Design a protein around this ligand. Structure first.
Ligand SMILES: CCCOc1ccc(S(=O)(=O)NCC[C@H]2CCCN2C)cc1-c1nc(=O)c2c([nH]1)c(CCC)nn2C
Ligand SMILES: CCCOc1ccc(S(=O)(=O)NCC[C@H]2CCCN2C)cc1-c1nc(=O)c2c([nH]1)c(CCC)nn2C
Ligand SMILES: Nc1nc2c(ncn2[C@@H]2O[C@@H]3COP(=O)(O)O[C@H]3[C@H]2O)c(=O)[nH]1
Ligand SMILES: Nc1nc2c(ncn2[C@@H]2O[C@@H]3COP(=O)(O)O[C@H]3[C@H]2O)c(=O)[nH]1
Ligand SMILES: [Mg+2]
Ligand SMILES: [Mg+2]
Ligand SMILES: [Zn+2]
Ligand SMILES: [Zn+2]
Lengths: 811, 811, 23, 24
């Protein structure tokens, strides 16, 4: 009894004690699967107990996975009792074709209804444009609207009242607002108490719209998140397939659309490619102008081309996947019958169509195309536009997989896809420019080959097969060709082709060509590698034609370098370190070293921005000659190395790249020290045979020796007797003065005294400066290497004496 | 006081609380008739909880009340679970490893948000294998620990760090359907053994609201992140397809445009070198010991890791973008070594708390000014479709100070994946430039071999002998005076007659006559053609023709001569102006302009680059192309003194004239010319007909297109002595192509092109005459009576061949 | 159904279609 | 001060070699 008084006197003390132990039990019971203990089969104001139970019941619908429609309907049923309204409805906000509309989702909701009796299927949808009555007014107003008395108070519509044989006099609606965009509109119609709705009902609606707003907010965000995720995947997957290869437009578009077929969420969709021909040829225009054929009168693209779908790609995803490509589709093709792709190509506008059969503007198929009864219900068509604002194709997307019309999110998804495809038309354009540019290059390269390759009439000046046997060279046996050449080729000893003082002045170009073939014979490489005689003669003659008719770098310079290399191997005994295969490539590389020399320096190619300069950033003319020399060797009739096996061919080529590029003076000035080390080390061996055997094995030092030997041969004109040198000089200076004039007129630059005509009388001073700076090191070391190349050093020393004498006279 | 009594008698407590309460309350309690809701204070708890819970529902509706709502929930969750503290750990994934970082810490019922919100730099991070939080987040189920000591996964990091010791732990994972958002824990203050089963149920039912607010927050963040990624891919693709550029410009454009969506303080893009091997001269120094082999890091492909350019983006306080050509090793982005490490491994690196990282060297302290220190770094490799790392992109401090999470990793990885794939647009750009350069070089190489040089032009001009000056230094009157003394008169080589024969003239004489034909037309003086250009152009055209049996320079001149004699002798000049006669003769000269000796059918069969480049009418488009190319040269441009209108008109005619030489077009447009002839017959006199035809453009083109066909086949109309010889040259060319098809293509040639059927040459010639030649010359003779000699001779030739054909039939 | 429409979605105003322009 | 008693860095009990993501 005492405790009873203590609890009863201090009622507050009994409160938090109840809160301490009996509060968890209350909350757990209330939040569990319980139904509100309020007599909804009545009409009265709710006290705190009933109000709390209604709130708790609405809170109980916040379970996982948030079924949006069921939870909203539950709020609607409670709002029926609280607001004393008769029926409630919900209008989802939707936007297609840029205009907004409201589509019914829940209709005829009363306090004694179920979800199935009020849910609205897409086929039973009622669509309200924003320019209509109270439903449209609320969406535009974004504020509670209370139609208090009757329908004579502006912006009221009678369609649904006639459609549903119902009468609406009292309306109180409010929009569900997701920050700045309207998601749905909730509405009440009529009121079974008497005179409409009071401000209390507006407060009740606002109070209990908090739960409905949260449910729609989750539903709206999940849909937005899913749509944006699909757009990211579409762009990524499309980019992956676009950049896989460089292919034409039909192959590229087919790959991209097929890959992203999962994210589009459509049953069927097809793409029609328009012809891009803007102008016809003259012979196709003549019949029209002369009246033979009537002019074109069909629809035209905005840029001014005839609308002609030449290829249509069809994707079918009904359940039996099928992809077809139709060339020249018939005008009654199922995709093109409606005329919508033609309309899109004509106007270039994005088209969104709901209820395609009921659309009278386009002749859509009202019959089931498929045996399963696949109606065409929703269609969305947009044009594919390249960077020139021309229409490349029309992409059409048919019924969605969920049955709902294409809203603003579907339009944005496919618009990004068509924007990406329209941009990616650049790749097929480059691919078409690819084949044309490659074919044009091959055509011109074949044109050069004819102008340089020796023909059947010119080869008879050396082979003379017609006079001896009466047959053409390609019919004569190798023994017969050898017998003719033996009596035609000049004698090596008589012409002194293996001497360091040999002069080409009293010989003609044909005699130089005959000499060149003889040097190949004297190396015993024709029989060893089974080089065909006709190919050898044709190759040497084509080399004669390849060299330009310029002052110094003509074919005569090419032979003198090649002749010197032959003498260095034979007379200089530098062949003792090299194999027969290498000597064959080394001599051949010398003959082709400055093959298509234009008479201009490497630095000139830098300054004039020649196509050679852009192609070869490094040493230019050395690489250009190497490429051209290989091109001549690749031809069948000119391929000397055609009888060499795989291993020998690459080794022969490898010597050719190094030797030809070694002719650059920039490379020589960098590696001249390494050659000095090699020649210095050569003196640490007891016998010459020991050094030789070491040289056959090491390949890096063989290449460096070969690279230096190219430099010695290239400048070998300085070692010739004074009579030959005095004419070779002033013959290359003429080439330098021509380039100097080119730089003055073309580049508006003052040339160096080496290139200047005004300093012609100062030339001998530069030659001494040239000998003392470049040529002296080449031959001083080589003469130290081999005692047999002493005449080269003796020749240049004599020449420097004469040039110095001339320079002394000038001073 | 009495609390221990009512604890020991649960039956009394339930009985006392089951008693109804008097209307007298203690404090407000929203007493709307709720004193006896089936318990003494259950309704009081019902109303108070509903009012508090509803206020929370209101809070989530606004926006960013996530932390505020959760804190209020945890404040209310405590004191009903009697937990001492309540905390919230957010779930995030970096580097593929999930972490749980603290957002809210110990929450007493009297706490405030400022005392419990955890700044990102002050947060505690746990992995999934440490603590009960990892246990909860891995199994995705509730964990109730009745004693911390017996727990096998408990971690004492936070216990020692703060000061508090934990005894009972109750945690749940807040579930977003499939992913984990957060973990909520309640700790201690049970005043008993542990958390009871009634606290187990209340925790889940009460926290369903917290799941709702966290689900909205998580969805909003996910929706925002996906939106940014979609825009990044769209804007990046827009800039990639703008044009074909190199990797430097393309990466700079894409990264600069998405700088807003990236949401980073700074980020730098470093580009790696793409050279695989080095040239021979770069390998020699390391082989002879002059240099040491590379010992630094290497890419997985095997390249030496060298950054040949670094693009720096600074967005912290002022937008500054720098491009460093040679980035030194002390560069702020590179000094860390992370970009070097990424290039080594190719792994996506995400770093939290950079100054506390010991693996890399992040400079502890401020970079530049304004105290900008590195806190969070994210680096990914840019990899092309060939699985080669072309660059490394490093992203620095997030703009909101949070560590880089999974959403950021996906955002930048998609950007780098897209930009890595788009290297193909840069590889194609480089190969574009090389093909264009190679084509331009080959064109120059062709141009030299076909153009007339200084020495060869002295065969027609001799300016050196007569004046001592080069042709480029002579005035027009002097050049005209010498040409008059050199060029033959109109009465010497029968240039005005239909029976002209070139068998009595040399190639140089044909060239001189060709220049003479231009002089007789009067186009040189009227259009101001420099004489040197005219002579060079004609000589160049002579060189352009190959040295083949029939389609050689002699055939080219014969066609031009017949065109000249058609205009002047045939009186077809009446319908054309001097400008049009200019184009026709020139188009006649260049109609077989490196014709290769084979027809279009062979080009299709042999798959020549001509067949690939030109879809149809090959070898006429080629002849048109090369003839235009020769005229484009400055020294060979005879149209260089024609204005834009006249130049375009002449070029337009040459396209029509040269292409119409194709026999396929002549057959298709044969009847069109016949109608034109018939329209002439409807007129009364030539004066009226001339005035009508000289103004119509389409009719003149068709007539002129037919003139080329008569000129091309003009050898038939030649006298029998000329025709018999020419027909053998044509047969020889056909037999040569017949042999080529038999050997190269292994195809049986037609009887026209068969050596074994040479005895059928007379019979086929008659068939040729009766099928092709008869129509053109019959109508032209009908059109103009001056062309009648050609038709008379054609019939005579047919009689001669028929006599031979009948003779062969006899045997 | 609830909206008393079996066939398809219905709109009070049926006029010439309005189509969206490209971005 | 912060309720976590941690200043200037997100400390972590996990000590070891950092693990980095691999490309997809
Ligand atoms: C006899 C005519 C005078 O000609 C010259 C005048 C001066 C010089 S130079 O070395 O001192 N300055 C050139 C270097 C530049 C750049 C650095 C400074 N310097 C200004 C050399 C030559 C030269 N003479 C040749 O005989 C000769 C060549 N050059 C060549 C090219 C190499 C295939 N071949 N051949 C056979
Ligand atoms: C000299 C021996 C050839 O003489 C001929 C024999 C027959 C024919 S053909 O009516 O049969 N057309 C060929 C059609 C093919 C396909 C079907 C049957 N037929 C075999 C033409 C010619 C002919 N003779 C010429 O003199 C002559 C030309 N053709 C040509 C342009 C030939 C590109 N130019 N020139 C000057
Ligand atoms: N006939 C009918 N109309 C309803 C119902 N629920 C809401 N409404 C709305 O009543 C509105 C009256 O005219 P509106 O133009 O605002 O558009 C009408 C309907 O949207 C319902 O259950 N039946
Ligand atoms: N000081 C404090 N410690 C907490 C709080 N919540 C959890 N902890 C303890 O921190 C520990 C870290 O994660 P555990 O799984 O090891 O178990 C945790 C609890 O023991 C809190 O709100 N404050
Ligand atoms: Mg050279
Ligand atoms: Mg022809
Ligand atoms: Zn040279
Ligand atoms: Zn011809």
């Amino acid at each position: 009894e005492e405790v009873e008084k203590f609890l009863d006197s201090n009622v507050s003390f009994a409160k938090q004690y109840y809160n301490l132990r009996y509060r968890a039990k209350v909350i757990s019971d209330l939040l569990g699967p319980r139904e509100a203990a309020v007599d909804f089969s009545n009409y009265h104001a709710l006290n705190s107990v009933e109000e709390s139970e209604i709130i708790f019941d609405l809170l109980r619908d916040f379970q996982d996975n948030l079924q949006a429609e069921k939870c909203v309907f539950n709020v609607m049923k409670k709002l029926c009792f609280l607001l004393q309204a008769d029926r409630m409805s919900l209008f989802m906000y939707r936007a297609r074709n840029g205009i907004a509309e409201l589509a019914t989702r829940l209709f005829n909701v009363h306090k004694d209804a179920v979800l199935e009796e009020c849910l609205v299927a897409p086929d039973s949808e009622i669509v309200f444009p924003l320019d209509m009555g109270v439903v449209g007014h609320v969406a535009l107003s974004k504020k509670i609207v209370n139609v208090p008395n009757t329908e004579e108070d502006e912006h009221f519509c009678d369609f649904v009242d006639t459609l549903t044989e119902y009468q609406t006099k009292n309306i109180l609606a409010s929009p569900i607002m997701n920050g700045k965009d309207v998601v749905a509109i909730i509405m009440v119609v009529n009121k079974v108490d008497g005179p409409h709705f009071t401000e209390n009902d507006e407060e009740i609606l606002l109070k209990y719209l908090n739960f409905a707003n949260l449910i729609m907010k989750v539903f709206h965000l999940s849909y937005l998140h899913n749509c944006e995720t699909r757009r990211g995947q579409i762009l990524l997957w499309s980019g992956s397939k676009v950049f896989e290869e460089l292919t034409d437009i039909e192959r590229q578009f087919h790959k991209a659309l097929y890959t992203v077929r999962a994210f589009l969420n459509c049953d069927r969709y097809s793409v029609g490619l328009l012809d891009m021909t803007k102008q016809k040829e003259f012979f196709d225009v003549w019949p029209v102008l002369m009246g033979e054929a009537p002019p074109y009168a069909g629809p035209r693209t905005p840029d001014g081309r005839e609308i002609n779908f030449y290829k249509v790609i069809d994707y079918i995803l009904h359940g039996k996947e099928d992809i077809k490509v139709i060339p020249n589709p018939p005008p009654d093709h199922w995709a093109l019958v409606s005329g919508l792709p033609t309309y899109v190509a004509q106007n270039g506008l994005i088209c969104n169509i709901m209820n395609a059969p009921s659309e009278d503007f386009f002749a859509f198929q009202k019959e089931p195309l498929d045996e399963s009864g696949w109606m065409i219900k929703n269609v969305l068509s947009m044009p594919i536009v390249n960077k020139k604002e021309e229409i490349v194709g029309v992409a059409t997307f048919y019924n969605r997989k969920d049955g709902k019309p294409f809203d603003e999110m579907d339009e944005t998804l496919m618009e990004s896809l068509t924007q990406f495809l329209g941009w990616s038309v650049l790749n097929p354009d480059t691919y078409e420019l690819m084949n044309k540019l490659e074919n044009r290059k091959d055509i011109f390269q074949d044109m050069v080959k004819y102008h340089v390759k020796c023909d059947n009439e010119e080869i008879q000046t050396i082979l003379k097969t017609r006079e001896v046997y009466g047959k053409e060279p390609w019919e004569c046996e190798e023994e017969e060709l050898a017998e003719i050449l033996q009596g035609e080729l000049p004698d090596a000893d008589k012409y002194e082709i293996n001497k360091f003082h040999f002069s080409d002045l009293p010989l003609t170009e044909l005699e130089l060509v005959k000499c060149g073939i003889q040097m190949y014979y004297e190396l015993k490489v024709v029989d060893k590698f089974h080089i065909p005689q006709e190919a050898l003669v044709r190759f040497m003659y084509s080399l004669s034609k390849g060299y330009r008719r310029i002052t110094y770098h003509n074919w005569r310079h090419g032979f003198n370098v090649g002749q010197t290399m032959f003498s260095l191997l034979v007379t200089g005994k530098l062949k003792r370190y090299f194999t027969d295969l290498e000597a064959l490539a080394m001599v051949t590389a010398a003959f082709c070293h400055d093959i298509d020399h234009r008479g201009t320096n490497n630095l000139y190619q830098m300054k004039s921005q020649n196509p050679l300069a852009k192609l070869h950033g490094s040493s230019i003319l050395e690489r250009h000659h190497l490429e051209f020399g290989k091109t001549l060797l690749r031809d069948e009739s000119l391929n000397i190395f055609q009888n060499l096996n795989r291993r020998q061919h690459e080794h022969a080529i490898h010597m050719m790249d190094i030797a030809i590029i070694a002719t650059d003076l920039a490379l020589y000035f960098k590696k001249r020290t390494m050659f000095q080390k090699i020649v210095d080390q050569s003196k640490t061996y007891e016998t010459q045979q020991e050094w030789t055997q070491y040289m056959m094995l090491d390949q890096t030092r063989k290449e460096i020796v070969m690279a230096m030997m190219m430099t010695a041969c290239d400048l070998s004109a300085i070692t010739k007797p004074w009579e030959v040198q005095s004419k070779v000089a002033l013959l290359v200076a003429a080439e330098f003065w021509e380039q100097g004039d080119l730089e003055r007129t073309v580049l508006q630059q003052n040339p160096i005294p080496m290139m200047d005509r005004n300093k012609a009388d100062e030339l001998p001073k530069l030659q001494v400066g040239f000998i003392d700076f470049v040529c002296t090191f080449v031959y001083k070391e080589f003469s130290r290497f081999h005692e047999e190349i002493t005449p080269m050093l003796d020749g240049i020393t004599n020449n420097r004496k004469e040039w110095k004498a001339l320079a002394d006279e000038y001073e | 006081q009495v609390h221990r009594f009512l604890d020991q008698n649960p039956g009394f407590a339930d009985q006392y609380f089951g008693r109804k309460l008097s209307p007298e309350d203690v404090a407000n309690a929203c007493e709307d008739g709720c004193p006896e809701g089936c318990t003494s204070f259950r309704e009081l708890c019902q109303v108070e909880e509903s009012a508090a819970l509803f206020e929370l529902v209101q809070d989530m509706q606004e926006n960013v009340n996530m932390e505020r709502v959760v804190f209020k929930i945890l404040r209310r969750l405590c004191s009903i679970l009697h937990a001492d503290r309540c905390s919230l750990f957010m779930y995030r994934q970096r580097n593929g490893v999930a972490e749980l970082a603290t957002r809210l810490f110990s929450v007493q019922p009297d706490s405030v948000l400022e005392d419990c919100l955890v700044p990102p730099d002050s947060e505690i991070v746990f992995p999934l294998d440490i603590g009960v939080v990892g246990h909860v987040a891995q199994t995705k189920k509730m964990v109730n620990v009745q004693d911390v000591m017996e727990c096998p996964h408990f971690s004492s990091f936070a216990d020692e760090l703060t000061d508090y010791v934990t005894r009972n732990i109750l945690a749940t994972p807040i579930m977003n359907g499939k992913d984990v958002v957060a973990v909520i824990m309640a700790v201690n203050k049970l005043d008993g053994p542990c958390f009871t089963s009634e606290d187990e149920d209340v925790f889940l039912k009460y926290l369903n609201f917290g799941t709702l607010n966290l689900k909205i927050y998580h969805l909003s963040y996910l929706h925002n992140c996906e939106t940014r990624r979609g825009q990044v891919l769209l804007w990046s693709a827009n800039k990639v397809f703008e044009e074909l550029t190199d990797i430097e410009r393309q990466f700079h454009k894409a990264f600069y445009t998405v700088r807003a969506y990236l949401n980073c303080d700074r980020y730098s893009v470093g580009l790696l070198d793409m050279t695989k091997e080095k040239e021979f001269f770069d390998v020699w120094p390391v082989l002879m010991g002059e240099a040491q082999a590379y010992s630094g890091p290497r890419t997985p492909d095997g390249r030496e890791i060298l950054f040949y350019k670094v693009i720096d983006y600074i967005l912290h306080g002022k937008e500054d973008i720098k491009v460093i050509p040679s980035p030194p090793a002390d560069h702020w982005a590179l000094a860390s070594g992370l970009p070097t490490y990424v290039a080594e491994s190719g792994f996506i690196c995400n770093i939290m708390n950079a100054p506390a990282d010991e693996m890399f060297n992040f400079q502890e302290g401020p970079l530049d000014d304004s105290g900008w220190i590195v806190k969070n770094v994210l680096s990914m490799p840019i990899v092309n479709k060939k699985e080669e790392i072309v660059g490394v992109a490093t992203f620095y401090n997030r703009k909101d100070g949070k560590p880089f999470d999974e959403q950021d990793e996906v955002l930048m990885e998609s950007l780098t994946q897209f930009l890595g794939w788009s290297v193909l647009n840069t590889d194609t750009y480089d190969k574009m430039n090389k093909l264009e350069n190679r084509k331009d070089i080959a064109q120059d190489m062709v141009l030299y071999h076909v153009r007339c040089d200084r020495e060869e032009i002295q065969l027609i001009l001799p300016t050196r002998e007569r004046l001592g000056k080069e042709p480029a230094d002579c005035e027009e009157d002097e050049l005209g005076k010498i040409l008059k003394e050199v060029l033959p008169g109109p009465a010497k080589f029968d240039i005005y007659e239909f029976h002209f024969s070139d068998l009595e003239c040399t190639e140089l004489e044909l060239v001189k006559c060709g220049i003479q034909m231009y002089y007789e037309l009067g186009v040189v003086r009227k259009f101001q053609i420099p004489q040197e250009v005219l002579v060079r152009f004609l000589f160049s055209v002579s060189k352009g023709y190959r040295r083949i049996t029939y389609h050689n320079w002699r055939h080219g001149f014969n066609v031009a001569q017949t065109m000249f004699t058609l205009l002047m002798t045939g009186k077809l000049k009446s319908y054309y102006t001097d400008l049009e006669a200019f184009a026709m003769v020139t188009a006649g000269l260049c109609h077989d302009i490196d014709h290769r000796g084979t027809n279009n059918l062979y080009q299709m069969k042999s798959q020549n680059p001509l067949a690939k480049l030109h879809g149809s009418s090959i070898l006429e488009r080629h002849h048109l192309e090369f003839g235009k190319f020769l005229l484009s040269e400055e020294t060979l441009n005879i149209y260089q003194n024609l204005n834009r209108r006249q130049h375009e008109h002449v070029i337009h005619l040459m396209d029509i004239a040269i292409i119409a030489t194709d026999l396929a077009l002549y057959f298709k447009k044969r009847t069109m010319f016949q109608k034109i002839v018939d329209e002439s017959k409807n007129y009364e006199d030539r004066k009226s007909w001339v005035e009508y035809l000289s103004l119509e453009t389409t009719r003149k083109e068709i007539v002129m297109a037919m003139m080329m066909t008569a000129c091309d086949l003009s050898a038939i109309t030649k006298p029998w002595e000329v025709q018999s010889k020419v027909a053998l040259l044509v047969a020889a060319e056909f037999w040569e192509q017949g042999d080529l098809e038999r050997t190269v293509l292994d195809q049986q040639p037609i009887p026209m092109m068969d050596r074994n059927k040479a005895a059928e040459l007379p019979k086929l010639q008659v068939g040729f005459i009766d099928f092709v030649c008869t129509f053109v010359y019959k109508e032209f003779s009908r059109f103009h009576e001056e062309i009648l000699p050609m038709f008379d001779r054609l019939q005579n030739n047919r009689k001669e061949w028929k006599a031979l054909a009948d003779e062969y039939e006899a045997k | 159904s609830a909206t008393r429409v079996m066939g398809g979605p219905v709109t009070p105003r049926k006029g010439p279609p309005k189509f969206k322009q490209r971005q």
